[PDB]
Write a protein that binds this ligand. Structure first.
Ligand code: 3B3
Length: 264
């Protein structure tokens, strides 16, 4: 209802909703996210601000914004593929080669953000969308923040994200580095892709499955389903001390990351 028609609803969140919009003239589809500033103005000025810095094949495109009352309309690459979340069969996952391709594209997109000083802070399957050729795009920069500016890094302090995807250090430390928190969330995504379940409600000492993982009891029930090469990588990513945790440039040299699996 704004040059374009609002055809169907797409992701009815908390803020408002993402609707799929078609232009009646040119037939061209986009996603419009609708936030009613009445039902925050602050995190949304940061969302559009971050969006405008973004340009990458693995990040959802930002087209633009109008304000039409209280009503902000962010205009965004429609992804006809939906969420990665729906590609994961519960308890089983997906073919190893499909996970590897999606993990590569997740890595490209994270490398890019980090490169420009931006941490997403809430990477999970629900926020990874698939285009027409199944290419992964990181989506929703609503919790995104800047962690490097004029080449100085700032530690984060605010806790945010989604508990099963969060790194331990965000539960435990007053300040922590952004990058390792995104790497961790990437590991839980890999886990989800390869087993079809989440390892733990949260990475606390007070949580059994997490305790079990630090004790390397991988005979148990996310990990058993995985396979020794991708598991090896997961042992490097889901390391509790954020300093000893593998980094991306080192994920790119990992044996499974570089294992040939998948046809064109
Ligand atoms: N973090 C956003 C979460 O993905 C919301 N759920 C969604 C499902 C499907 C589509 N879509 O283009 O089919 C969306 C498209 C744009 C935004 N969200 C979508």
């Amino acid at each position: 209802v704004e040059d374009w028609d609002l055809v169907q609803t797409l992701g009815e969140g908390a803020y408002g909703e993402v609707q799929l919009a078609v232009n009646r003239v040119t037939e061209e589809a986009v996603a419009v996210k609708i936030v009613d500033m009445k039902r925050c103005p602050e995190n949304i000025k940061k969302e559009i601000c971050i969006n405008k810095m973004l340009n990458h094949e693995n990040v959802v495109k930002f087209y633009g914004h109008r304000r039409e009352g209280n009503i902000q309309y962010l205009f965004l690459e429609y992804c006809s593929g939906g969420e990665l979340f729906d590609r994961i069969e519960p308890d089983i996952g997906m073919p190893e080669p499909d996970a590897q391709r999606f993990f590569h594209q997740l890595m490209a997109g994270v490398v890019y953000l980090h490169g420009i000083g931006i941490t997403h802070r809430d990477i999970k399957p629900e926020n990874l969308l698939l285009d027409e050729r199944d290419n992964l795009k990181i989506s929703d920069f609503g919790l995104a923040t800047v962690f490097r500016y004029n080449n100085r890094e700032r530690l984060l302090n605010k806790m945010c994200g989604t508990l099963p995807y969060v790194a331990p250090e965000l539960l435990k430390r007053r300040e922590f580095h952004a990058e390792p928190v995104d790497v961790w969330s990437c590991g839980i995504v890999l886990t989800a892709m390869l087993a079809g379940e989440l390892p733990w409600d949260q990475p606390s000492d007070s949580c059994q499955e997490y305790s079990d993982w630090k004790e390397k009891k991988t005979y148990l029930n996310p990990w058993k389903k995985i396979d020794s090469a991708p598991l090896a990588l997961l042992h490097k990513i889901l390391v509790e001390n954020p300093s000893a945790r593998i980094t991306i440039p080192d994920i790119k040299k990992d044996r499974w990351y570089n294992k040939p699996l998948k046809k064109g």
